[PDB]
């Protein structure tokens with residue numbers, strides 16, 4: 001038993017809700033919140049800009065030190081950093097950005113990072129300003145992640161489309 005509430009169960013291990021991931025993070029305080037990161041951990045907009053804003057820019061300060069030490073992430077890769085006031089940990093995962101021409105097959109590699117964590121609160125990778133089809137992203141999630149994932153979808157219209165079209 002865990003504290004996630006109001007989710008629709010899509011599969012054995014994948015759940016979905018129309019929710020603001022920032023508000024869901026602040027209420028649940030999950031062990032892991034996933035950020036929709038880029039390789040530079042520049043959290044300017046989308047999910048990342050919103051998570052960073054909610055930390056009063058502490059996420060960005062921590063991220064800049066991480067990059068100065070380690071260099072950029074790989075597309076499809078991840079790193080674990082602090083969850084600040086939102087979660088114990090933040091798993092920064094880089095899905096491909098279609099608006100940068102990156103290979104959509106890397107979306108499966110991105111979701112594989114979730115399997116290193118027993119339970120996660122997450123957005124749909126590569127959705128939103130990353131330019132992928134969220135229905136495709138949901139399918140890759142369900143077919144790749146084996147751990148327990150609670151997906152927060154900000155847009156109610158997108159949410160109902162995702163549920164109604166789910167196979």
Ligand SMILES: Nc1ncnc2[nH]c3cc(F)ccc3c12
Pocket residue numbers: 019020021022045046047049050123124127128152153154
């Ligand atoms: N794409 C998402 N999925 C789940 N939660 C979200 N909160 C957001 C806040 C923003 F400013 C932008 C995007 C999201 C978002």
